[PDB]
Amino acid sequence: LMSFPQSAPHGVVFLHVTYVPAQEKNFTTAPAICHDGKAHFPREGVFVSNGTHWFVTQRNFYEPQIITTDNTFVSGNCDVVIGIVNNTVYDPLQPE
């Protein structure tokens, strides 16, 4: 994250402030989601499964969010990606 230098006789001391993760939990992951006949890949996150639903969260922190069109992009069909699962994709334009 950042460092703070410190003076020392015939030397220097660095106070390295680092980010150490903790309290990790196991989750079920998937390579892509097949809802509208095509695959949906994460844009900046990763698909996770708590056992009954699927959510999108960042890599360095657990922040589950609803799978939306703004968080994923469409690329290719579904019969190419190995291990792709089927899950619904929320579209904010439909309720609007």
Added chain:
Amino acid sequence: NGLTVLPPLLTDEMIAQYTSALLAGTITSGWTFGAGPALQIPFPMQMAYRFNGIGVTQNVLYENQKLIANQFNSAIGKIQDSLSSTPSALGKLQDVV
């Protein structure tokens, strides 16, 4: 005449075990094992993260994982053939000795 060679502290077996442990951590945790706890992650996802880091979309990997694995196996085979054929691979260590 007094010239005595002392063996190193870490033996070859310990070096091999360290190398195997580092390899296992790399293949099972990507880069998180060095910064903290070894978070398990599938290898096709570590490769996707690497491609996203180098500036390539992950769909290319999710579509050509088979071709990439074949190329990696062929590269490993060629490296082994070069190490078995070319004796000047460890020339630096040979010159040091």
